[PDB]
Ligand binder design. Structure first.
Ligand code: NAG
Ligand code: NAG
Ligand code: NAG
Ligand code: NAG
Ligand code: CL
Ligand code: CL
Lengths: 211, 275, 222
């Protein structure tokens, strides 16, 4: 199968910027290449076919070029509704293959997260498990290290993370980290701490079981 | 170079035909549509294994190697027995042809039989009569010369995609002032019996253009009662017998040649009476 | 208007079979090729299979070759995908897509809404909803956070609202995570003024249609 590699995987830009996405093919595919735009929870929309033919109804700020193995998608002046993920797809030969995608996010100034920690409810402890939740609210950029500590013991393997999409109003992200313990392990320790690192700043929010 | 040989279907009811491929001894296929030269996209490079549905247009297909055998695909059109309403006049030329689905782009191509003109229409829907249309200014001289023209019309819902063209129809049309140019010559009246005459004429110039000539009409005028009678004649016949004539009465005979859409100009009148 | 509506999705156990259907309307179904495209959660698009207009040509991706079968019923304007020996990796949203030509070629100009197909030996189960309570003594200045932990449901998805939709400012509902037990979990949080914790009631509304379970949890400070 023909491999389709896009570059970059993600990028941040501002309204008015000129955005260029590249797509490279493991074999020559002449001009049998398409470009799609997909927004979260929606089907893709075809933007460009034949490497450079603009699909009907697509604004003229979109344009494609290239032939053989190297192709480029260009947005001359980025608009608010253009922030999304973009895929290339070859239809030169079967099986048809897509690129891994390129997410175009909106750039803003740095923002430190507001950090909150939640002990497990008494209602959940009955079930014999304990979920400890750490909330990172309204921060930018997306990169952030979260580290759980139980009586200062560094935790690993027992947590999972989840990130929202960029907020429509302030373009920040929010993150949640859930530490899962057994009721027996949870009742064995006192101090539960969530440490968040961003740049030169580490912030730790903690609680004491039973207070 | 791979010893692959092509095959093509006959033109189907959709105006399409599949170009297929078979190997009997990397490589790619280059496809060039020759007909309708005024289109923006004329060539496409394809993988050998995918076998497109071409139109009845003429194509150049070649297998190109990546480290060339070429076939000139003959045209294979669909001919309409019904002539199109093509009107050439003082202010321009207008066409009507059977349309298909909506938002269709048509390419009209013509050449005098025995100057290759090309025209590309904007997307258009069928009219209430199921017809598409296009018109040219007088300056264009669109089929303005009194000659027999061969016309081919193509259709595509995506004219930028080369492998999506379909054949609509091919037809013949006599350009210029066909009504005047079609007038029969050498009209003659001959004594056939004591009460009848034979009328003969040379074949109309329209008869040389396939499907254009609908019929002849012979008009006989009784110069005493002023009564008029018209006799239609098959286009394969250039003779008719007029009977029931009265002695001493003067008669006038004229012949015209009609198309499916135009009344022809009458020939010079022939005066005669029973001997 | 051109429309493509998928159906047949749902839960299927590993090794079992499932049959997807696409109902086409608004165009001449017999004149266009059709394809299936799937998208795993949080992943990119993956072309599954394609079929020509007269069903003479069929093509498949490598990962589904020999296990999937695409077919069409041109008299009923229906596209089919027969999935056999389903694995967990086949869990994705499956889209119905139209090709512009007789043959399998060019891009996809028309898509369906998509249907979720979850391959897992887990059983359908409504979620447990636990409070993420704010303290009654503010420790974050004038801003307080609270929320709901929606734990151990199957399959996707759940929808979360606050105060019957009356509360949307500051609401963050995170995407679900697949836990090692095979069940899903997510949280929904809201930031609110700390002075309003005593006077105002906050209720998260969790709805899980696959199990016909609706849960309303009042979140009170602790
Ligand atoms: C043929 O087309 C011409 C030009 O539009 C029009 O004037 C004429 O009425 C048409 N004839 C018929 C019989 O529709
Ligand atoms: C053709 O010529 C005749 C005169 O010979 C004229 O009456 C008629 O209007 C002309 N027709 C056209 C379409 O020019
Ligand atoms: C041509 O245009 C003139 C006006 O310049 C108009 O009077 C005449 O009717 C038109 N005739 C045709 C056949 O278009
Ligand atoms: C033909 O000639 C004969 C002999 O002259 C005559 O009797 C007859 O009336 C003529 N017929 C016509 C139609 O003039
Ligand atoms: Cl279309
Ligand atoms: Cl007259």
């Amino acid at each position: 199968a023909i491999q389709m590699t896009q570059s970059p995987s993600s990028l941040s830009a501002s309204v008015g910027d000129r955005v260029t996405i590249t797509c490279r093919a493991s074999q020559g595919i002449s001009s049998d290449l398409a470009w799609y735009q997909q927004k979260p929870g929606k089907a893709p929309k075809l933007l460009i076919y034949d490497a450079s033919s603009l699909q009907s109804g697509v604004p003229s700020r979109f344009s494609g070029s290239g032939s053989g193995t190297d192709f480029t998608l260009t947005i001359s002046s980025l608009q608010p509704e253009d922030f999304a993920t973009y895929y290339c797809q070859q239809y030169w030969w079967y099986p048809f293959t897509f690129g891994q995608g390129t997410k175009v996010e909106i750039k803003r100034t740095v923002a430190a997260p507001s950090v909150f920690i939640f002990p497990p409810s008494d209602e959940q402890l009955k079930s014999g498990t304990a979920s400890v939740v750490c909330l990172l609210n309204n921060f930018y950029p997306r990169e952030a290290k979260v580290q759980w500590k139980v009586d200062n013991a560094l935790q690993s393997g027992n947590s999972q993370e989840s990130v929202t999409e960029q907020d429509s109003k302030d373009s920040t992200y929010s993150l949640s980290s859930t530490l899962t313990l057994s009721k027996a392990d949870y009742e064995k320790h006192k101090v539960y701490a969530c440490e968040v690192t961003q740049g030169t700043t580490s912030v730790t929010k903690s609680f004491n079981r039973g207070e | 170079q791979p010893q692959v040989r092509f095959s093509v279907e006959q033109l189907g009811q959709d105006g399409r035909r599949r170009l297929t491929l078979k190997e009997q001894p990397t490589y790619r296929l280059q496809l060039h549509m020759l007909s309708c030269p005024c289109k923006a996209k004329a060539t496409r490079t394809l993988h050998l294994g995918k076998m497109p549905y071409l139109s009845g247009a003429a194509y150049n297909v070649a297998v190109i190697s990546s480290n060339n055998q070429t076939w000139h695909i003959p045209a294979d059109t669909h001919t309409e027995p019904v002539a199109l309403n093509i009107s050439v006049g003082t202010n321009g030329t207008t066409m009507y042809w059977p349309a298909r689905a909506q938002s269709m782009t048509y390419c009209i191509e013509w050449q005098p039989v025995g100057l290759a003109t090309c025209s590309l229409t904007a997307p258009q829907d069928p009219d209430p009569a199921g017809m598409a249309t296009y018109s040219w200014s007088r300056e264009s001289g669109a089929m303005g010369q009194e000659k027999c023209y061969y016309i081919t019309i193509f259709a595509s819902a995506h004219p930028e995609k080369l492998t999506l063209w379909s054949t609509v129809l091919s037809t013949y049309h006599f350009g210029g002032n066909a009504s005047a140019a079609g007038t029969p010559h050498h009209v003659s009246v001959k004594n056939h019996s004591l009460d009848s005459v034979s009328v003969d004429w040379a074949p109309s110039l329209l008869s040389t253009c396939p499907g254009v000539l609908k019929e002849y009409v012979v008009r006989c005028r009784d110069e005493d009662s002023k009564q008029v009678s018209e006799h239609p004649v098959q286009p394969t016949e250039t003779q008719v017998t007029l009977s029931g004539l009265r002695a001493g009465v003067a008669y006038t005979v004229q012949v015209r040649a009609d198309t499916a859409w135009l009344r022809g100009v009458w020939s010079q009148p022939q005066r005669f009476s029973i001997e | 208007q051109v429309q493509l509506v998928e159906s047949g999705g749902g839960v299927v156990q590993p090794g079992r079979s499932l049959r997807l259907s696409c109902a086409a309307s608004g165009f001449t179904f017999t004149s266009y090729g059709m394809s299936w495209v799937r998208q795993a959660p949080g992943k990119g698009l993956e072309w599954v299979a394609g079929i020509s207009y007269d069903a003479s040509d069929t093509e498949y991706a490598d990962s589904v070759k020999g296990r999937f079968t695409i077919s069409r019923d041109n008299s009923k304007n229906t596209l089919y995908l027969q999935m056999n020996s389903l694995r967990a990796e086949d869990t994705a949203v499956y889209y119905c897509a139209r090709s512009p030509d007789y043959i399998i070629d060019y891009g996809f100009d028309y898509w369906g809404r998509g249907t979720l197909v979850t391959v897992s030996s887990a059983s359908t189960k409504g979620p447990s909803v636990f409070p993420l309570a704010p303290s009654s003594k503010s420790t974050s200045g004038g801003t307080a956070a609270l929320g709901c932990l929606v734990k151990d449901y199957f399959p996707e998805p759940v929808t979360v609202s606050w105060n019957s939709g009356a509360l949307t400012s500051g609401v963050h509902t995170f995407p679900a995570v697949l836990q090692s037990s095979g069940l899903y979990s997510l949280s929904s949080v809201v930031t609110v003024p700390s002075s309003s914790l005593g006077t105002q009631t906050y209720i998260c509304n969790v709805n899980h249609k696959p199990s016909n379970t609706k849960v309303d949890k009042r979140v009170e400070p602790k």
